[PDB]
Design a protein around this ligand. Structure first.
Ligand SMILES: Cc1cc2nc3c(=O)[nH]c(=O)nc-3n(C[C@H](O)[C@H](O)[C@H](O)COP(=O)(O)O)c2cc1C
Ligand SMILES: Cc1cc2nc3c(=O)[nH]c(=O)nc-3n(C[C@H](O)[C@H](O)[C@H](O)COP(=O)(O)O)c2cc1C
Ligand SMILES: [Ca+2]
Ligand SMILES: [Ca+2]
Ligand SMILES: [Ca+2]
Ligand SMILES: [Ca+2]
Ligand SMILES: [Ca+2]
Ligand SMILES: [Ca+2]
Lengths: 317, 321
């Protein structure tokens, strides 16, 4: 099997392990890339020397292609742009910001550029400015979310643009992967499930929170401030929502002191009470710690089996 | 081809036209059932005589199975429950409320019961009290919504229960329908796209709102009150939002403003085409809906479009083991 994504990126599986701040370090990304998917380092708000450490690590683990996810509103964005070009990174994905500032520079260096998009208008603009592909990420995803769901966003984006679309948000098995393809995506991006990979350095407490999570255990915080974040319910989200209910009755320092280094606390130190346990709605389905390779194969061969089984049921229609 | 749903309901297509208040009358439901899908009358908050008129209409149009969607918190719920038994309706779907009260009564009558569920826990409980199937409706759906999306809800519900699951929310072409099947659904339920059916009596202004909508043109109203409703943005949604913000700043706000804005809002839009002051309920998939077609053409696009997509993807994936 081939897709425009497998062919453009020269990878065996049409599966990205999503760039994730703190979680997506060299070890995790390396494991995914070695296994045949696209590992992606989460640049987040890390300065150059930190991101370089992860790139050094991945290059020591595998020679296969990998991505770096750049957060464009990072105070260190200019350094991270330098770094990926300096290091010969094959693929860049970008969060919310303005990739147009960097597009020609990336392309003059030979980098493939794949912005994350929350809307049809944004996907069309990304295509217009020369993006090689886009990731359509549903609001069910972990982390900073838009408003459209994977079902409706992926379908509408795939219809609107000619460049390949990668479905992200809510995918944690072969069935979910296959659905993504049915909507018109040519690859899938998986986040939540990769956090519990054996090669993931997410604290055991963070992984445990995902493993034990029910379907209904995520919530959206900070929606009223225009910075909606999806995470597993805990003391932080409760205290945050309590303070939001308060604020809607009327001071924003209480929120940024509540949120300051929240993700790091959880991922690195396993403070899953006071930290931010970002994860998607599909956390409910994620129930086993497995190797990155095992996850990739389950996603890929699970998709294949489901598609073949369903094709059999639908033959002659 | 057949699924457990086509077998249970004795219909040709594993496709429901979802019950919709005001929009899903006998004409639309009749047209869908006649063409081989499951038409479903929207009971809404209507009294017995109004719902009966719709049942009488379908029966005059087709002998084929149809459903009635019952809103369990309606002041006339007991009468609508009477009505569906009295008229020998084959299927009942249930939106709002817990149908446990009525489950044995429906089954003694021989009715197939299919509750709409927003969670794994509720799906499992519907299963154990005897539901014949469940509809897993994603938050992208038009109307009163839960929090889980179609991608995540359908998948988790299908893995959790043995009874068949129907995917609803965000489906408006063969690709969306095929996706629902991949997630483990054995039928799909479609709302938004059936609103623009030629046989739909939604006012031309209402249809035009859906047809011109973009992907980002829906919004959720009344979340601060805990009463989430998805609709196309308009003066009503702007008014409700501004009023909501203002109310929460007051010690003792007059909540009559909200019941005056919302009362009969859907009916105003659907029957009379007040798409500025009325409620234009519609799903996020409204942006994809671009064509007025017959119920049959919509059914066939969904069904044969799904078959085509599955066959195309099978050709891409064949031999992968
Ligand atoms: C812990 C965590 C951190 C994330 N951080 C980022 C990020 O820094 N940049 C970004 O573009 N996406 C971020 N995401 C989104 C993922 O890259 C991915 O698209 C998403 O997790 C897919 O949805 P899923 O979680 O349902 O699989 C993050 C997700 C998680 C779970
Ligand atoms: C105008 C409109 C009215 C609706 N009214 C009801 C209702 O009364 N009861 C119910 O269970 N669902 C109601 N729904 C939801 C549908 O029955 C169906 O599940 C939903 O529209 C499917 O999602 P979709 O709009 O993305 O196709 C309504 C939907 C719309 C668009
Ligand atoms: Ca995001
Ligand atoms: Ca396309
Ligand atoms: Ca390790
Ligand atoms: Ca509903
Ligand atoms: Ca099942
Ligand atoms: Ca008519």
């Amino acid at each position: 099997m081939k897709t425009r994504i497998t062919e453009l990126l020269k990878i065996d599986y049409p599966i990205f392990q999503g760039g994730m701040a703190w979680v997506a370090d060299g070890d995790l990304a390396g494991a995914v890339s070695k296994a045949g998917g696209l590992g992606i380092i989460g640049g987040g708000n890390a300065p150059k020397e930190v991101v370089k450490a992860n790139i050094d690590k991945i290059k020591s683990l595998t020679d296969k292609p990998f991505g770096v996810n750049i957060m464009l509103l990072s105070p260190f964005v200019e350094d991270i742009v330098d770094l990926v070009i300096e290091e010969g990174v094959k693929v860049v994905t970008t969060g919310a910001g303005n990739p147009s500032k960097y597009m020609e520079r990336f392309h003059e260096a030979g980098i493939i550029v794949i912005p994350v998009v929350p809307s049809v208008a944004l996907a069309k603009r990304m295509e217009k400015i020369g993006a090689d592909a886009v990731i359509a990420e549903g609001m069910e995803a972990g982390g900073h979310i838009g408003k459209l769901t994977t079902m409706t966003l992926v379908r509408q984006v795939a219809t609107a643009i000619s460049i390949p679309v990668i479905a992200a948000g809510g995918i944690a098995d072969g069935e979910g992967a296959a659905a993504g393809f049915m909507l018109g995506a040519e690859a899938v991006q998986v986040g939540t499930r990769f956090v519990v990979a054996k090669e993931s350095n997410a604290h055991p407490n963070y992984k445990e929170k995902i493993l034990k999570a029910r379907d209904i255990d995520t919530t959206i915080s900070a929606q009223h401030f225009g910075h909606a974040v999806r995470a597993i319910k805990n003391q932080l989200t409760r205290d945050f929502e309590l303070a939001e209910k308060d604020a809607f009755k009327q001071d924003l320092e209480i929120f940024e002191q509540m949120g300051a280094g929240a993700l790091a606390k959880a991922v690195v130190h396993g403070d899953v009470d006071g930290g931010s346990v970002m994860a998607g709605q599909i956390a409910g389905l994620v129930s086993k710690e497995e190797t990155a390779e095992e996850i990739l194969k389950d996603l890929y061969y699970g998709a294949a089996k489901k598609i073949q089984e369903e094709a059999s049921r639908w033959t002659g229609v």
